């Protein structure tokens, strides 16, 4: 494939837990 795909993912991925890391329980 274009291999770009595995690092999307991974961009994504970090920015996913960013996202959420953003918000803090307490």
């Known amino acids: 494939?274009?291999?770009y795909?595995?690092?999307l993912?991974?961009?994504l991925?970090?920015?996913v837990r960013?996202?959420?890391?953003s918000?803090?329980?307490d």
């Open 1 to 3: 494939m274009k291999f």
């Open 5 to 7: 795909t595995i690092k």
């Open 9 to 11: 993912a991974k961009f």
């Open 13 to 15: 991925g970090g920015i």
């Open 18 to 21: 960013a996202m959420l890391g």
């Open 23 to 25: 918000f803090r329980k």
